[PDB]
Design a protein around this ligand. Sequence first.
Ligand SMILES: Cc1nn(C)c(C(=O)Nc2ccn3cc(-c4ccccc4)nc3n2)c1Br
Ligand SMILES: [Mg+2]
Ligand SMILES: [Zn+2]
Length: 314
Amino acid sequence: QGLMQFTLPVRLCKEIELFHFDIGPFENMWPGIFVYMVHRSCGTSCFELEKLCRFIMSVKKNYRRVPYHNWKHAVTVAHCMYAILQNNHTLFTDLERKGLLIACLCHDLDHRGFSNSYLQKFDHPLAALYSTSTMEQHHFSQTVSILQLEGHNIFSTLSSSEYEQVLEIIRKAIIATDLALYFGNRKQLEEMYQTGSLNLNNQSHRDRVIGLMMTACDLCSVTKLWPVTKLTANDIYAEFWAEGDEMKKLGIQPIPMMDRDKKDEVPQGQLGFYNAVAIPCYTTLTQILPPTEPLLKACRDNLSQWEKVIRGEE
Ligand SMILES: Cc1nn(C)c(C(=O)Nc2ccn3cc(-c4ccccc4)nc3n2)c1Br
Ligand SMILES: [Mg+2]
Ligand SMILES: [Zn+2]
């Protein structure tokens, strides 16, 4: 009988319920922040704590020391999904809520800071094992691996068929973080909502809405207060530019997003992205799940902050 709660300090206990929460620069608190989120989202009974803790720590170990796709990203993306699940209490099964916080913390396992594009032009062995969504099939592969280490099976009290449902929600959730897949997924959801045929009882439909949720959580840097958003931009471009450096070494002109000699275009490159991906993403999500409106508001605040960078007012 487990009378053992995690409690956070007052400021965190209050801020962590808000969508724009920043998990802070103290790495050693991030595991307690995740367990706290599982317990409130899912219950104290969801996972054997010894097993949960061991799993968290093996996930941490299999994230690399890159500027953006790192352990802090993992925990950030999982906090966004917690906030979505907490403002949509009744819409999700017990299994989706277990699976989705895990999917979020695993979604970029063993990321090296390179796009799928660069793996295919480098001719990386993972581009032969997996032809599309290369890094994403790999992240799911790494998650099965850690799940199958001794003491690390956190679903060990699910039946054979419940266990297979959760691993299938985790798989689809990780594949959907392939931003190449998002454009189609969002248009479909857009039509389904506007012709009125979107049904949350239809598993193929649920699967699209989770997919969208995964895109929203993954991109949640654009939904933070401006000082966080802006400082996280530096880390994103530090990967993008290292990737352009590697493209130039293969003898290919990278796109300007990856070319550090084109740092000047960055504010205009963020507008493109906010208009072409982020605003559309958080728009369709608010339409399907009205309580996520604060992600769209925050996103429109950061688009307005980037227009102010261009008009030389910062
Ligand atoms: C959060 C977040 N998650 N992702 C995947 C992104 C992203 O993809 N951001 C982007 C998109 C397109 N861009 C074009 C340029 C750019 C720069 C200089 C000169 C010219 C163009 N910069 C861009 N940045 C952001 Br934010
Ligand atoms: Mg990813
Ligand atoms: Zn990610």
